[PDB]
Design a protein around this ligand. Structure first.
Ligand SMILES: Cc1cn([C@H]2C[C@H](O)[C@@H](COP(=O)(O)OP(=O)(O)O[C@H]3O[C@H](C)[C@@H](O)[C@H](N)[C@H]3O)O2)c(=O)[nH]c1=O
Ligand SMILES: Cc1cn([C@H]2C[C@H](O)[C@@H](COP(=O)(O)OP(=O)(O)O[C@H]3O[C@H](C)[C@@H](O)[C@H](N)[C@H]3O)O2)c(=O)[nH]c1=O
Ligand SMILES: Nc1ncnc2c1ncn2[C@@H]1O[C@H](CSCC[C@H](N)C(=O)O)[C@@H](O)[C@H]1O
Ligand SMILES: Nc1ncnc2c1ncn2[C@@H]1O[C@H](CSCC[C@H](N)C(=O)O)[C@@H](O)[C@H]1O
Lengths: 240, 240
């Protein structure tokens, strides 16, 4: 299985997540209101691990200048197509340097959990702090805390769009201090026939203290609020 | 991919077909009624390619004595558990010889489409007539005809049993004189994780007249009723 968000997996991302019920329009509106709460006059936003650019496409309608960073070229391609007039960088949230700062730096949908341990987490928070304006805000949607993760969780759904049926089923286990989530897809359409795809990801179960440590090492005050877009809450941090 | 109805594919059969809405109770009832129409005092019944023995289990409530014949040892094992007091034979519809005759010889759910070519169809029908009593009836549920099969058809459904989620997705193409149906499964549960399975079959697209000629060569009068249990109609033959 792949772990790199590429190929047909990357192609099926938007369809499966929309079918699961993810509402990027609501999420972007919530996020713009969160940002303006901590930074009333905020005018620009860097979305880190922006994936297919779905958040940016909507954040564009609340913020004058949006920008992305994304490690997977195949995810980035879809995002650039969707956000043709924004700058979207190919790069790595651990070690990136855009030479500018934004009112908000966001990292959504637990993309932070692709990092391996405290050192990587710390390095990414430090980069997020390096790209935020002095009156701005950094927003990170965490993965589950270890005590709130349910090993053995099964998600299964099937959606169809434009002649094609796509079933996605995931199963998750605890693997050391991370979730191993294994995801299988069957994709069937009249002319193309049926194929099976798979991916597999390790998503780190950082504790609240570990996120907090990373924010604080970056010069950011930190606040957690439970709930948020995926039930995992949101951290925000403010420089100074 | 397997073609032989074995292993996990055989274990999944009942759940997926019942999940798809197949009602062997109502089909058994209909079949028993149809049998009696033609042979009012009918007492015994042979189910050829009986698979998991689902029809047999309900036909037992209508006919004094039921028996089956199945090629696949793994399907048959399921059928023997389900029908512990009936005789179920391990054998081939193309050439079996049981030593006795029955009021009804049935062959249901397009099992007859595993045969290729007029010679095999003929052979099977002559065996069915070699096992029917003189006042009894042969019932064969055909596959689609070449004129009414829908190429490109995709089926997808999900069912859950015992904590396990099973998703089955089929694609069907016209592969010459048969339907190629390729079936994929994803099976997931909290304790067992996810597993993928696949089968693929050619199911022969015999014309109406090919079945008619098989029944005729076998000594049976033949009638066709459109619709039937699965949309494909039903043929019935009476020795004579
Ligand atoms: C709702 C719920 C979820 N979970 C965990 C279980 C499983 O690891 C995950 C939900 O699985 P999913 O719905 O198949 O995954 P999701 O759409 O959330 O996407 C997640 O996994 C994919 C692979 C990542 O790209 C994505 N960034 C993640 O959010 O979240 C829990 O532990 N408890 C819960 O109540
Ligand atoms: C609804 C419909 C279906 N079809 C064809 C398309 C496909 O070949 C078949 C439906 O496939 P399915 O629902 O996946 O299959 P089904 O449950 O009927 O099982 C069939 O294929 C399996 C492999 C055999 O063991 C079984 N003996 C067959 O009935 O029927 C048609 O031609 N016209 C139709 O209107
Ligand atoms: N080190 C890294 N730097 C930047 N992006 C990364 C990364 N590791 C993983 N990712 C990206 O993180 C994303 C996780 S999926 C979430 C994508 C998007 N934020 C959304 O909400 O839909 C994928 O696009 C993946 O390629
Ligand atoms: N030559 C042959 N003789 C006997 N059974 C056969 C066969 N070729 C295929 N089969 C059986 O045909 C069945 C098709 S599935 C239909 C099974 C059952 N009649 C039901 O209605 O649910 C499978 O059990 C397969 O193993």
């Amino acid at each position: 299985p792949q772990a790199d968000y590429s190929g047909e997996i990357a192609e099926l991302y938007d369809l499966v997540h929309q079918g699961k019920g993810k509402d990027y329009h609501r999420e972007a509106a919530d996020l713009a209101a969160l940002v303006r709460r901590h930074s009333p006059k905020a005018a620009s936003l860097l979305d880190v691990a922006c994936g297919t650019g779905m958040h940016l496409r909507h954040l564009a309608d609340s913020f004058g200048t949006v920008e992305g960073l994304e490690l997977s070229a195949d995810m980035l391609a879809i995002a650039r197509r969707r956000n043709p007039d924004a700058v979207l960088h190919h790069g790595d949230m651990r070690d990136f340097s855009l030479g500018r700062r934004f009112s908000a730096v966001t990292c959504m949908f637990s993309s932070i959990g692709a990092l391996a341990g405290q050192a990587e987490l710390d390095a990414a928070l430090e980069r997020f702090a390096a790209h935020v304006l002095p009156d701005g805000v950094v927003v990170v949607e965490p993965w589950w805390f270890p005590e709130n993760f349910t090993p053995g969780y099964v998600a299964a759904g099937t959606v169809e769009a434009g002649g094609t049926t796509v079933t996605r089923v995931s199963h998750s286990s605890r693997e050391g201090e991370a979730t191993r989530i294994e995801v299988h897809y069957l994709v069937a359409g009249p002319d193309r026939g049926i194929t099976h795809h798979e991916e597999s990801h390790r998503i780190t179960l950082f504790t609240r203290e570990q996120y907090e440590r990373a924010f604080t090492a970056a010069g950011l005050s930190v606040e957690f609020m439970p709930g948020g877009p995926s039930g995992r809450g949101l951290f925000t941090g403010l420089p100074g």
